[PDB]
């Protein structure tokens, strides 16, 4: 894997695997943390502002020029980042390259194309919330954190019909910048990408103050969704991995289809006394400024706090030193697996390559990652839970709430 850097702060990498499917991803720091109060719900639009007018091309031609070669134009976007992933066959990379940069480098963002594209937000906003997690989970950030990460990916209602194109040019000119970008590629040689950026990309927010908050949503939905967390640590620190191993100690979701998750100390701990369905697992998030850690609950209405008061107790058992080593090494082996299994795919591989290139300025091959996992201390896995229990708390939930308690309860 090549890995370089220009004087302009613009990273490049490349991995000529001699594969058929070329693939490019342009990881950028443009997540909605960089939004202020007045420009909210913007990245939700910008994430769809792809396939619009440029200078070097029109919206129409790009829509067809890709489907002729049969490629793609997908867009991942996080609270930190904003990726422009693509796909194609290696025989026509030169064309699709030009289509990409014109989106990022010469977008006009005219008036009328936007107005047709705004009400799309009402659709996209609701497709997620058919999957009810995606307003519970936003509320955590909006409950715990205040300014940057509190800003959701998606767009509030009222913002629709009020967005300005000028409001983007300020956003674009400030954040699609040669100092904080990463022109990753794949299935492609390195000098090519070195030639592209020097011609076209040759151009030039606050912290996540944790506070402790709480949000509630009596929505009438029959089932419950809830989450309790604490202030975690940011990535880079080995303390971060101490949570990500604790994740697997505690519960990481079903490795087994229809599995009773017996090894998971949490779901096992609720299996007693309860005699009805429920589903629950660890919650681990790790951003640049900070992270978040906790769990995510599913149950019936009357059986919310009856379940949570196992979890909030189960973690205290860990913090009180009660623990064994094989569960840890088991949990490590889970962690060591899911990393490689995530990057087994080129896409999931790509998802890791530049994400390090932005937070760090270096790629860590997986072998070195496993050694840092090998060097983890049980006295840090404890703290960890001690930081969780002893730390300030933030909470959110939805569903019916006839029997949902608060933090202090």
């Amino acid at each position: 894997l090549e890995f370089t850097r220009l004087p302009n702060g613009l990273v490049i990498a490349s991995l000529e695997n001699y594969a058929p499917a070329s693939r490019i991803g342009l990881f950028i720091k443009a997540g909605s943390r960089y939004e202020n109060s007045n420009n909210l719900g913007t990245s939700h639009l910008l994430r769809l502002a792809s396939s619009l007018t440029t200078k070097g091309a029109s919206s129409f031609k790009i829509t067809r020029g890709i489907e002729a070669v049969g490629g793609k134009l997908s867009v991942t976007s996080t609270r930190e980042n904003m990726a422009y992933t693509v796909e194609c066959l290696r025989d026509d990379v030169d064309i699709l390259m030009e289509f990409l940069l014109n989106v990022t480098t010469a977008p006009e963002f005219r008036r009328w194309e936007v107005a047709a594209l705004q009400p799309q937000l009402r659709i996209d906003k609701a497709v997620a919330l058919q999957n009810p997690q995606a307003h519970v989970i936003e509320n955590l950030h909006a409950a715990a954190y205040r300014n940057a990460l509190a800003n959701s990916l998606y767009c509030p209602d009222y913002r629709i019909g009020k967005v300005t194109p000028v409001e983007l040019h300020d956003y674009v000119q400030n954040h699609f910048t040669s100092a904080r970008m990463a022109l990753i590629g794949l299935g492609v040689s390195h000098p090519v990408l070195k030639q592209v950026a020097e011609q076209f990309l040759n151009i030039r927010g606050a912290k996540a103050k944790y506070h402790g908050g709480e949000i509630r949503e009596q929505n009438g939905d029959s089932l419950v969704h809830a989450a309790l967390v604490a202030e975690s640590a940011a990535i880079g620190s080995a303390e971060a991995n101490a949570f990500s191993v604790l994740q697997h100690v505690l519960g990481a979701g079903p490795h087994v289809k229809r599995g009773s998750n017996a090894t998971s100390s949490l779901y096992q701990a609720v299996a007693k006394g309860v005699h009805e369905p429920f589903d629950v697992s660890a919650f681990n998030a790790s951003y640049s400024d900070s992270g978040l850690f906790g769990f995510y609950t599913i149950s019936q209405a009357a059986s919310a706090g009856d379940v949570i008061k196992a979890a909030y107790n189960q973690v205290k058992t860990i913090a009180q030193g009660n623990l064994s080593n094989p569960d840890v090494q088991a949990a490590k082996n889970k962690l060591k697996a899911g990393y490689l299994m995530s990057v087994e795919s080129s896409e999931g591989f790509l998802d890791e390559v530049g994400s390090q290139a932005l937070a760090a300025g270096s790629y860590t091959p997986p072998s070195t990652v496993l050694q840092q996992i090998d060097a983890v201390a049980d006295a840090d896995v404890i703290n960890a839970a001690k930081k969780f229990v002893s730390g300030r708390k933030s909470m959110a939930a939805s569903g019916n709430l006839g029997h949902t308690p608060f933090i202090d309860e």
Binding site: R47, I66, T78, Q133
Partner: peptide, 16 residues
């Protein structure tokens, strides 16, 4: 889970 959005021109919309 660490949720992430995903749309496209031809990949169906998704939620990580």
């Amino acid at each position: 889970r660490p949720v992430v959005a995903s749309v496209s021109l031809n990949v169906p919309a998704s939620v990580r």
